[PDB]
Amino acid sequence: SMENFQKVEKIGEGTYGVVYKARNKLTGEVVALKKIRLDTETEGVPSTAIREISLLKELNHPNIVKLLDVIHTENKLYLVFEFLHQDLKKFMDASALTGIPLPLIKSYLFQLLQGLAFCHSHRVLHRDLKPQNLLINTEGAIKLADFGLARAFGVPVRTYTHEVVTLWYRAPEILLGCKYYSTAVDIWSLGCIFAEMVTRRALFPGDSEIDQLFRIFRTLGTPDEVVWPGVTSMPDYKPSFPKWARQDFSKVVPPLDEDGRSLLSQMLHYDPNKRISAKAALAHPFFQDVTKPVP
Amino acid sequence: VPDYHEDIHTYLREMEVKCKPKVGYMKKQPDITNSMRAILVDWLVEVGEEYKLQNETLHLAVNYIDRFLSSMSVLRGKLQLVGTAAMLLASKFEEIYPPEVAEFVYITDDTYTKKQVLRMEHLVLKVLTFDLAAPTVNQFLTQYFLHQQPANCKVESLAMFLGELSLIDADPYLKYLPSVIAGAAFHLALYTVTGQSWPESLIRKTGYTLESLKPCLMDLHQTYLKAPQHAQQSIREKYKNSKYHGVSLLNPPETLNL
Numbered sequence A: 001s002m003e004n005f006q007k008v009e010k011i012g013e014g015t016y017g018v019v020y021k022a023r024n025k026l027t028g029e030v031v032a033l034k035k036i037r038l039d040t041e042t043e044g045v046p047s048t049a050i051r052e053i054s055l056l057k058e059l060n061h062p063n064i065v066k067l068l069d070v071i072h073t074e075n076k077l078y079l080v081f082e083f084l085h086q087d088l089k090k091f092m093d094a095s096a097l098t099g100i101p102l103p104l105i106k107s108y109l110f111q112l113l114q115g116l117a118f119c120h121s122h123r124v125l126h127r128d129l130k131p132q133n134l135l136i137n138t139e140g141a142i143k144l145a146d147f148g149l150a151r152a153f154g155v156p157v158r159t160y161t162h163e164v165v166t167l168w169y170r171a172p173e174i175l176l177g178c179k180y181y182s183t184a185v186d187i188w189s190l191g192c193i194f195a196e197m198v199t200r201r202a203l204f205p206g207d208s209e210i211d212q213l214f215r216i217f218r219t220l221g222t223p224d225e226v227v228w229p230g231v232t233s234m235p236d237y238k239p240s241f242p243k244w245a246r247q248d249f250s251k252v253v254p255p256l257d258e259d260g261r262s263l264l265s266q267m268l269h270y271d272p273n274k275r276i277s278a279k280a281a282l283a284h285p286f287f288q289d290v291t292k293p294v295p
Numbered sequence B: 001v002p003d004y005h006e007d008i009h010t011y012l013r014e015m016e017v018k019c020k021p022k023v024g025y026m027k028k029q030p031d032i033t034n035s036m037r038a039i040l041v042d043w044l045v046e047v048g049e050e051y052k053l054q055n056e057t058l059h060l061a062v063n064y065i066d067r068f069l070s071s072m073s074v075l076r077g078k079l080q081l082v083g084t085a086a087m088l089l090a091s092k093f094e095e096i097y098p099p100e101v102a103e104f105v106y107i108t109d110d111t112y113t114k115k116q117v118l119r120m121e122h123l124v125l126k127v128l129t130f131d132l133a134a135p136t137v138n139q140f141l142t143q144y145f146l147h148q149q150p151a152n153c154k155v156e157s158l159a160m161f162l163g164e165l166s167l168i169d170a171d172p173y174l175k176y177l178p179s180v181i182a183g184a185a186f187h188l189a190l191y192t193v194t195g196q197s198w199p200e201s202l203i204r205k206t207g208y209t210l211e212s213l214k215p216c217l218m219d220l221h222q223t224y225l226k227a228p229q230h231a232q233q234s235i236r237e238k239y240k241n242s243k244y245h246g247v248s249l250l251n252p253p254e255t256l257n258l
């Protein structure tokens, strides 16, 4: 029964379901309720919900959104989450003119990496990191949310779903159709997000898979066998792809200091085997003076 | 190696203890037996082959069945309903393309209805409190394969064959953790194909000595020896295929020299 919850307002729609801001009428606790209609579902409880629930029950961390309860009513499934008042997307839009203060960018990326390192060390790939799924509170915390595209991975990985990550945040190994991808796809996404916080616009706003790739190539250089061994044999690599030269990061992310630029370049490394891990990124000198400002 | 491999292994070792079923549960089931379970698991191997499902999916489904039967009494005519829902859930968790519910209904030859399968899926989820991300023998095996000197496709296939046989017989395999069964499977496969033994790198990674693996190894060697005589043969048929290098055709060793 959802009798104890009062709907306050619809917040959004993520990978699956609809999310509402609601209030527990007995305790007063404000929550986010993800509702899934099961009578619309010919196939039972969807895989996205099965994965989100099972994985979030394992991931207890300050930078991962808390799953509080799961309720099965007549023909519906409700996931009860802690509520955070906004997402990183709306916060970036509200800061488009002023800019996000540098120490807050650093704190946010630090926290995102902490959350993501915890996911990866618990064999979970998120696979949909984007500003819309990153939630912020009044007190300076940022948290990963929406694990509907997440999945438990194995050591070593096998081939998983190709249709993953929102296009702008999608790693080149997925765009080029590689048989295998793993934790590096999440780091790519966070590299994009880091740049986006710094410049206030999406780094690679493509409108198709090919346009997405070409945007990447124009900024980082078209990769070759020296930069990324194997690249020219990947399934969707074509030798007719234009060969653009790499841009200087001074132009790409002007506000970013030397340490910031070093970290960012390692997060956007083409070869997924050499792309920086979440754990190693936390040890980068860019974070030596990290604080926790309130936004 | 990636700098989260050790963390994953440590975490899986924690979780296999939490996701373990009750070892004596079958004695408390008034109407089902180890033999009926064997038949069900062998049938799920065949379901897996028909739909081209991953080995991991089969291992997950078995984990869910045994956990479910650790707390719920089930009559013999409903055991296949439990198994079917378990395989559906495991396919949704693990597979890129899970088979659809109507296909699960079809492979039970309309023994159950769609409504029953979907209601059992809810009951399974409720009894397991949605905790579906269970460690399996398969998950440990694939980690152990990274320590080969060097990679041997026959050894991998045989270790997999043996880990899979362990699923069929609750007595004795319910008394071992997946990481241990995997250890024994890997050693036995290694020994059979190349004559090598459980390597020092895995002794360090797992903390399991070859001696610690011996009880499970003794059992698994017997299982291997008697496999051509066992009432359940779907796993053997499956591992004859060239995909698995026909390892189920190989003669087991007569002694382990332990």
Ligand SMILES: O=c1[nH]cc(C2CCCCC2)c2nccn12
Pocket: A011, A012, A013, A014, A015, A019, A032, A065, A081, A082, A083, A084, A085, A132, A133, A135, A145, A146
């Ligand atoms: O507090 C909130 N606010 C928003 C969401 C979602 C995030 C993904 C897009 C739809 C809205 C949320 N999931 C859990 C708690 N949550």
Ligand code: NA
Pocket: B026, B027, B028, B029, B030, B031, B032, B033
């Ligand atoms: Na019994």
